[PDB]
Design a protein around this ligand. Structure first.
Ligand code: BGC
Ligand code: BGC
Ligand code: BGC
Lengths: 448, 447, 448
């Protein structure tokens, strides 16, 4: 059984601005919704904030040297909107843009492909004060923001993502309130989802006007498997599937909103103008998949609003975030996505990884994380199987390069293949990182 | 409005060798400045700290002067050699007793004593053992700190370890304009490292035997762009690294600035991992000494930073040749707030200006309108900094008294209280009167 | 009749190192064959040399400001091999490379696209002492030189030329001896042509291995028109055409060498190994055309070696270099070139312009060159006509930005749209430059 990957298959690792950078309001940087959210008591585990995080804003050079040691060919990162445009619209912050300028140049000098994400959940607070994702004008705001980047990094950043995981943004930020801006409303959730999609479309159009390279969205998908042969459980499964996996992909593919949403959101559901769906379906060049696990939903009449709940799969290992370890579901999902996009849209796994307990400090210069190593090897093999089934998969980014702030769960959830001692900011490459470096070097042959 | 936050602490600052006099009195040991000032050519007009403001004898009068100024805090330094004549070993009872009387007297007046362990006056006996080039000083200093920590436990609650490491090393070891007067990049690098280590050791000792809050005091001189030429920007970063980041960065656990490798060349050294662990020992507060900014340009022959300031002729300059530019204070405070992550309480431990005053009062008065101007504009700049979110807890004017400006002698007057050095007569300047009103109205006078 | 040019059509101007730089052996720079050639009595008109020229090595910043005043979107320039690698092989000269580093950064800062040429006739003398273009190893030497540039300017210089005018290099340098290195030999001409082609191929391969962007060769073409209906005149035309226009193009297109060359060079003609032609035909991304005029050849039995000679076309104006002004022949050539390359290869006019008399100094701050203006307007119109006929033309470079050293003809031939007072180095923009600036600004609409 060989596991060598296709020619040009791109290996990398991924991060997000608020999760690693720190210095969030430093050097002209504006206030974001997470600056506010994280400094409100009760919102974050242990009261953790992104004020310091991995101190990447100051230590990015060391981090690039770590990327080189891991033999990374690509680095997927996000740009903080509020760092570049403090009020979201209007005046640009030179020092903030200069940071990403230095960063990208440092990456290109290192021979590492910069993969940029425009929006990774850190909306400028000034725009939130204007309604945020509930305000349709954001479609323009986002576009303008996008333009600033497109022209600044023209010819340097060739691969662009617009939005990272619309579902987490809306479901977490507007439906249940576990993420910034911390609203809890189905009425708001429907609107927010729609305007996120519109914003994506607007950004793609603007990219066609002033940009260079390839642009696409990044979706998270969590495949829903049958819990039983009861029809109510299958209806539950389809509700969960529609709300999480089809909500955004379907209108992006020109199929409109899933009908089940009408049942999920009830009186909060809306019909939107026809031209909106034209904007939303703006042709893209590639698509990113963020993937971690599957779920096995059963009927749950009291679970708002999908009336479903996952059944614990005790036969398999679970991560520190409680996600089942089940690699075949990655293969299936990739196939499924290939099918939903007609096989014509180039795909990339922009996030995949696992959280396990690591000590807060290295132990004789090492971090032994055999379960993360196992997750890594089995899921990369699953990628190979998906490619063997005809999926046009061009690359793979491990989440994450560094142990970082796992948003509302704080620093307790370590996804890094590089350990960060948050007391000292010292980095230590984990066994998982060493092994991933081996996977890249052999282009997969080490899995043989 | 310019009313300051509740509990905001107003005061003035001094240093031992600059005001005390009686350097060899009552058991007091010899310091490096006793030697330095009595070597011809080192000091302007041959000035020494032998008499200075005679504060050792007139401290009560000086405290009454503090009361007339409505001071809520007094920042001062303790002479190491006055307390421990050989730097190590036997304590000098009378010398320590001076500071005992002083601190008790301050507390009687309702004035908070802010004590600095080291303000440039190393015991000469330790200098003969290598001074700041000897790593053992980290321990020596710690022991010295302990003596004070236990003696003034519960009375002095706010402690500074070292005052301006950059001036100590750059002036004392790199260029030799200050005691002990060495000129060596090699020694400068080693000395800087041992100064930081000594700070760390003193903080640990404070954790074990001390009570209250402890921190270091850094001077910062923000470096602004001279042009858009890239060599001038590289120059700017060399200067900034050598002066402003050399000490702050390792204190915040980020190691030494990369640029230093370029600045010091073959004189730069790698140090053991545990040293930086000692150096970044967590502090409770930080002092900023601030006076001005600089606008560095490339200067290949300027050793060792290869940079030089461009004279900013659009603005007023002090008698020490420092540009008057209050906005740079605001910026610096913000910058400092960001470098320390906002978690560390900041205090302006020194700010002020030197202008010419006559050697005597004029019908009971000293009119210093430019010092008044410096004061009001920079205090307003403090208010602006607080408005931008800086956790700034207080402000100490340099200086309470006209004093010995080290190698520049008595020619540079920084006092808000005038000292006639012929008669030791004190006269409160217009700047002092105004500062007293700033304190009493808690800033409202600035409206 | 509109003359708006295609979207993205690139307007610029061109120079060559020895023709403008001066400071030829300054800052570590090595001796080139033109250093030797120009300082040998009898070789150059009026004893002119490239010692000072336009003093561009010292005044490049002023020249960039001049480019900005002309609204240039691109600047085509060459890199002096001996300035960067003094002995042609071995140690790099840091100051020499630093000059082009500063130049390129300055160009990019001004928003001007740097178009770099590896070889513009100035071979390092040390390599000439090893046989120059007669030594097959030059293919390797050139490649190594190319690499130095490819990596130094990776991501900054995106458009690369390998060789500027193989025909002038070989015919002028080795066949007739009018150009450096001043050899006169058909045997040497055949060998040199072959090795120039090989060097191009080697540089393209090396570029594929370590470079980034688009790379191609630059050919001059002088279309040969019928003088009469006499068959010997048509045979003459075909000889001249084969020797000048098809000699290099055909093997570059994989068609081997023109059959007629066997007749032109006789006993000096040679057969070369088959793999050489695999190397020569290495796929390129674009091709440059240098174009000035046409010829009308007739039979001339005593003319060595093509046995042909041009018939003076007295019905048309001639430039000071004695070249007929006939704009339709430009259109024809482009079409011809489009046909020879199958329409698949993006083309750019890398040189076009004319030499007319100008005074040595400005006349009240002006230089009135109405014939150069005329040449410019008619030939640019001819470009538009060529595009209408299906030529995939992406850009146009005026030769030249500056009055410069016209090689063996010295400073007597002014090609600049910017006048250079060679006594004072004062630059004065000519009426032609003013007009060209308006052409760029209106993207061709001024021609309407
Ligand atoms: O939950 C772990 C990770 O999930 C991903 O889908 C998000 O993009 C990350 O920001 C997050 O850290
Ligand atoms: O130059 C004026 C003052 O600068 C301060 O930073 C030093 O601590 C003083 O000793 C000195 O007198
Ligand atoms: O012969 C005139 C011109 O011919 C061009 O094709 C060359 O590139 C130039 O260097 C030269 O000035």
């Amino acid at each position: 059984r060989s596991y060598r990957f296709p020619e040009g298959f791109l290996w990398g690792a991924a991060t997000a601005a608020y999760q690693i950078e720190g210095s969030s309001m430093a050097d002209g940087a504006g206030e974001s919704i997470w600056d506010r959210f994280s400094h409100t008591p009760g919102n974050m585990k242990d009261g953790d904030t992104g004020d310091v995080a991995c101190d990447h804003y100051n230590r990015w050079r060391e981090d690039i040297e770590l990327m080189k040691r891991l033999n990374l060919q690509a680095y997927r990162f996000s740009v903080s909107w509020s760092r570049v445009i403090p009020q979201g619209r209007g005046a640009i912050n030179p020092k903030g843009l200069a940071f990403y300028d230095r960063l990208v140049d440092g990456l290109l000098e290192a021979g590492i492909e910069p993969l940029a994400t425009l929006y990774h959940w850190d909306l400028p607070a000034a725009l939130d004060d204007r309604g945020g994702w509930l305000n349709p004008d954001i479609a323009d705001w986002f576009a303008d923001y996008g333009q600033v980047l497109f022209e600044k990094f023209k010819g340097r950043v060739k691969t662009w993502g617009t939005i990272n995981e619309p579902w987490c943004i809306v479901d977490g930020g507007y439906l249940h309130g576990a993420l910034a801006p911390g609203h809890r409303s189905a009425y708001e959730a429907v609107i927010a989802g729609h305007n996120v999609l519109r914003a994506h479309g607007a950004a793609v159009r603007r990219f066609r006007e002033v940009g260079e390279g390839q642009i696409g969205i990044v979706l998270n998908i969590e495949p829903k498997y049958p819990a039983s042969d009861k029809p109510e459980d299958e209806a539950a499964r389809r509700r969960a599937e529609a709300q999480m996996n089809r909500w955004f992909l379907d209108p992006l593919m020109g199929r409109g909103y899933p009908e089940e949403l009408t049942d999920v959101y009830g009186a909060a559901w809306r019909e939107f103008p026809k031209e909106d769906f034209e904007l939303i379906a703006e042709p893209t060049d590639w698509m990113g998949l963020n993937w971690y696990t599957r779920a096995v939903p059963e009927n749950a009449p009291d679970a708002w609003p999908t009336r479903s709940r996952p059944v614990r799969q005790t036969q398999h290992a679970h991560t520190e975030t409680g996600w089942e370890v089940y690699p075949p579901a990655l293969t299936d999902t990739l196939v499924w996505l290939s099918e939903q996009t007609g096989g014509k849209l180039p795909l990339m796994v922009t996030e995949n990884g696992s959280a396990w307990y690591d000590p807060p400090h290295a132990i004789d210069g090492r971090i032994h994380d055999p379960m993360r190593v196992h997750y890594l090897q089995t899921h990369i093999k699953a990628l190979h199987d998906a490619i063997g089934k005809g999926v046009d998969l061009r690359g793979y980014m491990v989440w994450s390069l560094l142990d970082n702030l796992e948003w509302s769960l704080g620093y307790s959830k370590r996804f890094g293949i590089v350990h960060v001692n948050f007391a000292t900011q010292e980095r230590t490459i984990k066994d998982s990182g060493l092994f991933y470096a081996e996977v890249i070097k052999t282009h997969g042959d080490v899995l043989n």
